[PDB]
Amino acid sequence: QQLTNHIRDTLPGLRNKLQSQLLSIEKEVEEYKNFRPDDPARKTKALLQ
Amino acid sequence: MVQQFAVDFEKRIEGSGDQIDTYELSGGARINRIFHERFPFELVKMEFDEKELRREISYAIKNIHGIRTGLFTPDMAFETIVKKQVKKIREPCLKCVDMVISELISTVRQCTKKLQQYPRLREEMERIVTTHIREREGRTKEQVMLLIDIELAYMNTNHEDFIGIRKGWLTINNIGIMKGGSKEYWFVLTAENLSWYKDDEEKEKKYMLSVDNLKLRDVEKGFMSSKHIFALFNTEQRNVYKDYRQLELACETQEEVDSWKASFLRAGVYPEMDPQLERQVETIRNLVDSYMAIVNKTVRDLMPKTIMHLMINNTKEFIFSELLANLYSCGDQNTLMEESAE
């Protein structure tokens, strides 16, 4: 019972770490997931930036 | 044009660059520094009648002591007055946010309608920016509320609170026959004691008197009627410690006499419950003012910082990084960038 209580008590720490990593990465994968080689608009946006 | 818009907006609101409008206006988003120096006005537009504050404090004490006899002023009599005063500033903070949003919308319009000849483009580039501004209105208001709510959550008396009232010159007209004449001196009246000085350095400390157990009266016209006169007299002892014929004191006007009397009344003196409660009420009133000065100071400082972080900087980041991505998403990209007849 103590081993089970310990293993469950650490879940909140792991959940916050994974949630933090998704928030940091999300801003860029949102754009990478929409990559298409045939996209003159993507090229134009990069040029302006 | 997108490049020119982003650059023009940033110059106008930050104030950087050349070609500044040195003559015509105080304008171009430098108006916002007025709100940050106008919001300090709304925080003092509010007023209260002190008699309502005294009544409210009195019921606060009696309602904290439910049945018990009171020895010391309860702390909750302080906390529940401060919480009630702080709730009042929710409104002016929201007015400040709304005024700032209004100026951002006006500035976006100047940088858009006046510089672009293409139809439809000046609509998309105005619509998108004002939509983004409105969403930040939402996030900004939540943060302001979670700041005032924090001011209520805990009372901190460590930094600048009053850590544990009237001044002017008076002349004594009736001097003992061994000296004669009249003596002009510096008088300091506090809520606790009276102190006599020879000058405004307040170094001599020649006389000290208690405020308690003294009485005030007017004087009969047995004198050359050139000054207004009152008397501070004692009925519990034959002398006012160091006495000068019941300390008859002349003033230039009756209004000065009445202001003095009012100051004595504030200090605890009675006119020509009462023993215990009135002293407790005055202690709380003073402590409340000293703490509210700190609350107001902190609010004036943090509000413009909250707005800059949450509304202004995110708008600039949007203009530089996202604006073009959204214009490609509007309409059908066929009627956009179609020349007007002119």
Swiss-Prot record, chain A:
Domain of life according to the entry: Eukaryota
Post-translational modification: Phosphorylated by CDK5 leading to synaptic vesicle endocytosis (SVE) activation.
Modified sites of kind Phosphoserine: S24
Compartments reported by the entry: Cell membrane; Membrane, Clathrin-coated pit; Cytoplasmic vesicle; Presynapse
The record's note on its domains: The dynamin-type G mediates homodimerization and plays a role in self-assembly. The C-terminal proline-rich domain (PRD) mediates interaction with SH3-binding partners. Is required for DNM1 self-assembly.
Family label: Belongs to the TRAFAC class dynamin-like GTPase superfamily. Dynamin/Fzo/YdjA family.
Oligomer status and interactors: Homodimer; homodimerization is mediated by the dynamin-type G domain which promotes assembly-stimulated GTPase activity. Homo-tetramer formed from two dimers in the absence of lipid. Oligomerizes into a helical polymer that self-assembles around the vesicle membrane, when associated to the menbrane through lipid binding.
Record function comment: Catalyzes the hydrolysis of GTP and utilizes this energy to mediate vesicle scission and participates in many forms of endocytosis, such as clathrin-mediated endocytosis or synaptic vesicle endocytosis as well as rapid endocytosis (RE). Associates to the membrane, through lipid binding, and self-assembles into rings and stacks of interconnected rings through oligomerization to form a helical polymer around the vesicle membrane leading to constriction of invaginated coated pits around their necks.
Pathological condition linked to this protein in its record: Developmental and epileptic encephalopathy 31A: An autosomal dominant epileptic encephalopathy, a heterogeneous group of severe early-onset epilepsies characterized by refractory seizures, neurodevelopmental impairment, and poor prognosis. Development is normal prior to seizure onset, after which cognitive and motor delays become apparent. Developmental and epileptic encephalopathy 31B: A form of epileptic encephalopathy, a heterogeneous group of severe early-onset epilepsies characterized by refractory seizures, neurodevelopmental impairment, and poor prognosis. Development is normal prior to seizure onset, after which cognitive and motor delays become apparent. DEE31B is an autosomal recessive form with onset in the first months of life.
Record's protein name: Dynamin-1
Species of the source: Homo sapiens
Protein encoded by which gene: DNM1
Residues of the full protein shown: 283 to 331 of 864
UniProtKB/Swiss-Prot annotation, chain B:
UniProt superkingdom: Eukaryota
Subcellular location: Cell membrane; Membrane, Clathrin-coated pit; Cytoplasmic vesicle; Presynapse
Outcome following mutation: M76R: Significantly decreases receptor-mediated endocytosis
Residue numbers of Phosphoserine PTMs: S16
Residue span, GED domain: 281-342
Post-translational modifications reported in the UniProt record: Phosphorylated by CDK5 leading to synaptic vesicle endocytosis (SVE) activation.
Occurrences of domain PH (ranges): 165-269
Regions that span the bilayer: none
Modified residues (Phosphotyrosine): Y23
Oligomeric form and interacting partners: Homodimer; homodimerization is mediated by the dynamin-type G domain which promotes assembly-stimulated GTPase activity. Homo-tetramer formed from two dimers in the absence of lipid. Oligomerizes into a helical polymer that self-assembles around the vesicle membrane, when associated to the menbrane through lipid binding.
Function noted in UniProt: Catalyzes the hydrolysis of GTP and utilizes this energy to mediate vesicle scission and participates in many forms of endocytosis, such as clathrin-mediated endocytosis or synaptic vesicle endocytosis as well as rapid endocytosis (RE). Associates to the membrane, through lipid binding, and self-assembles into rings and stacks of interconnected rings through oligomerization to form a helical polymer around the vesicle membrane leading to constriction of invaginated coated pits around their necks.
Family according to the record: Belongs to the TRAFAC class dynamin-like GTPase superfamily. Dynamin/Fzo/YdjA family.
Record: disease: Developmental and epileptic encephalopathy 31A: An autosomal dominant epileptic encephalopathy, a heterogeneous group of severe early-onset epilepsies characterized by refractory seizures, neurodevelopmental impairment, and poor prognosis. Development is normal prior to seizure onset, after which cognitive and motor delays become apparent. Developmental and epileptic encephalopathy 31B: A form of epileptic encephalopathy, a heterogeneous group of severe early-onset epilepsies characterized by refractory seizures, neurodevelopmental impairment, and poor prognosis. Development is normal prior to seizure onset, after which cognitive and motor delays become apparent. DEE31B is an autosomal recessive form with onset in the first months of life.
Domain note: The dynamin-type G mediates homodimerization and plays a role in self-assembly. The C-terminal proline-rich domain (PRD) mediates interaction with SH3-binding partners. Is required for DNM1 self-assembly.
Entry protein name: Dynamin-1
Originating species: Homo sapiens
Residues of the full protein shown: 332 to 720 of 864
